[PDB]
Amino acid sequence: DICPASEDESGQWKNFRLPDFVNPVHYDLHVKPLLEEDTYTGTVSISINLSAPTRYLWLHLRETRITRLPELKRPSGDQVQVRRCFEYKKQEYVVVEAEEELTPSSGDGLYLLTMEFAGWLNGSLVGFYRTTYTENGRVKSIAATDHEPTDARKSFPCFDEPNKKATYTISITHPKEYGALSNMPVAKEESVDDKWTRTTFEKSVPMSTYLVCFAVHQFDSVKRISNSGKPLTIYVQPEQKHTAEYAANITKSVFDYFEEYFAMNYSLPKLDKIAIPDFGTGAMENWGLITYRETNLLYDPKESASSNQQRVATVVAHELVHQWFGNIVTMDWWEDLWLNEGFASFFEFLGVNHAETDWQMRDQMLLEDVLPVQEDDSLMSSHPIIVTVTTPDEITSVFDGISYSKGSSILRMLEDWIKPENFQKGCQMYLEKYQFKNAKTSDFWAALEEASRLPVKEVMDTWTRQMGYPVLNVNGVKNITQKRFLLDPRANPSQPPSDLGYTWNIPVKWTEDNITSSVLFNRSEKEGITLNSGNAFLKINPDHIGFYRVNYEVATWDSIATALSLNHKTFSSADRASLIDDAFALARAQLLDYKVALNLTKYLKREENFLPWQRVISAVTYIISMFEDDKELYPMIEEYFQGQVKPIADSLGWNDAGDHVTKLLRSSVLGFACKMGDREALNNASSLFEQWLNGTVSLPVNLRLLVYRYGMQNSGNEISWNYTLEQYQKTSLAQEKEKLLYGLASVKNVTLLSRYLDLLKDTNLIKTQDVFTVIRYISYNSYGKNMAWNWIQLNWDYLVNRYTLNNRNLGRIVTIAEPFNTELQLWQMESFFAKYPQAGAGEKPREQVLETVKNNIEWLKQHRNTIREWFFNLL
């Protein structure tokens, strides 16, 4: 109405990217929520550095409307006259046109642009929004913001690109029963009415829009003080106050550890953490005001699992890394998003390893990032680490395994190759140089090149400007060659076109009889290299430290299987996991006969370590799911793997005894025993479940999930389902809530799963943040694999309307179709995609799941007989 939409394309605002010549310096931002009305108003004054004659000024805005014709100031101070404003929908712009046009800001003076705006707090988890919780039976409110990547523009009009850094002074007018938080400490509070308070916060350092955050709350708090003397506090519902203790501990330990490690002071005078009762992501690193989903922040040692403990520790550590990597130094464009997320995914492990000594975190990187992303990045529908993004939907899509896990993995390779000492020193220098400014990937290589004089740019570029990774082919124990590793043998290894032609500079490390050597394998050595002691065995890629697979000669592989049978401790736990992971991926890729791979599992009755078991379980999970409906193969695979875990499952027993890693092992090992149909493990789950239903017994924390799942699956009925649903509502602990939702997803009853699906539309029962989690859980159920898939189809229009096509979790939901393995199922997927071809942030996930389902079909055709023979002959 006031800035009507116009389809006028003839101007620079048709460009997706903001212009070079318009630049903000300072934001004067005021918001006033009407909490009970689910509305807000605000004005913003922006100081602008103009560089080129322009008759239009434009910036980002979505959903929120401008309410008053905006007003512009010359650097002298005069009022610039305004002819019109109009919204440009296609690129999310509000555009203002001067009668005239004016000239650059030449001195220290700047233009001032001021605009009034009104928006909504309801129906969304992005921008500025309100949600509720219950305290002592009263419904309470809390409002907060969430912006990354392109939602700042929903909160208030701004120059919403990460490189358009400016300084912030924020003020909020709110009811006095509430406190107000932002990025910075509170400067001054003044009474507006006898009812309203205006809270003003002190000036910010230059920062990106996506990091700007404020909240209105009635939360209690748990406090700690850094070595720097700065208050670190976690805000938390009074009811849940006890569950903030652990996160408080970890924040102190990791904050103190990082400041020392990066040799840089934290830029702000305080740091706050707070979990919003309904929160769309896991956590967000807003400078000084880090927001969380409760499952990632709130932990009860009496109720939560070690899995939960580690998740809390890791996400806090992750979010703290961003205070240096991401906040102080930010990427110039989202194409370089890995400079934020990859670095956070790397240092999170260093952080938690300091805080928790016997968690073997450095090894756990293999389980969390390296090996899983090696699956992802073996598909044709992967993408290079540096990713071309041209729409908001494309931007939000690349918050994925490549940015995080491959990013983490190639940094891990880099540190080892370049040595930790020099890696550290290089990071510091990068951090010194670009502080409060923006960097490109090139800027980071050059930084480390100063620390090593090694050819970092030349080597790392190959891991960074093309998708995929290599397999190393072993010829004659000692000669290696490189070839791109793709899961689909039929795929064209040269597509999509890459300047580097899918050859890499691979820093290669190996172990000759306990002694370790190093070589860089040049791209230009087209016919491979030879590794420099009259040897009979060569352990290549120790601890799977490089981002590649090693394919030994078959005879070698055969001797490894024998060596594992004789004395498995010959190899380190990581090395075992790695060899196993490679073998099975190689087999999957038709690069290694499956008999060779399966031979490596024969030793397992004596396997006792976490890492190998995790990668074995991952590999078997895939094979077993491909044979679910095969009445012939399944029992035989079940029977075998049941026999292989049985000793360790029995040995560890159904009880929380031992150190961290041991307790995690028991969880996954007992779970696998249950999965494989071990009658005695299932009976343990059923017995405990039956006891839990008596309403007193508090289950051992690391067994709960297994007990809810297998307990419900084996003896669940309407009575226990209803009970479990009540218990889910009643517990305050989000970590317990989540386990209970998985439990409810486990019942073997179509009617009850149908009720559960219907609950997804009920926001009094399932929170908006949790809908996709629940859908995914149901999809794992033997009945619900198809129910969830059908439901998202029938309710696609409803989901799009509720979440929008820009929602990451909605785009990814199609991956529930991953276990599909027939031409029928593939046709269903394709028909549904063709009916709803606007995929938004789901465009890549659709590509990926189709490639996966196609590979499954092929895989069955190629391998069913081979895998049959191995099992038939054995059993």
Binding site: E148, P149, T281, G282, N296, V315, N340, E341, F399
Partner: peptide, 4 residues
């Protein structure tokens, strides 16, 4: 961003 953790994506959860």
């Amino acid at each position: 961003x953790v994506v959860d």
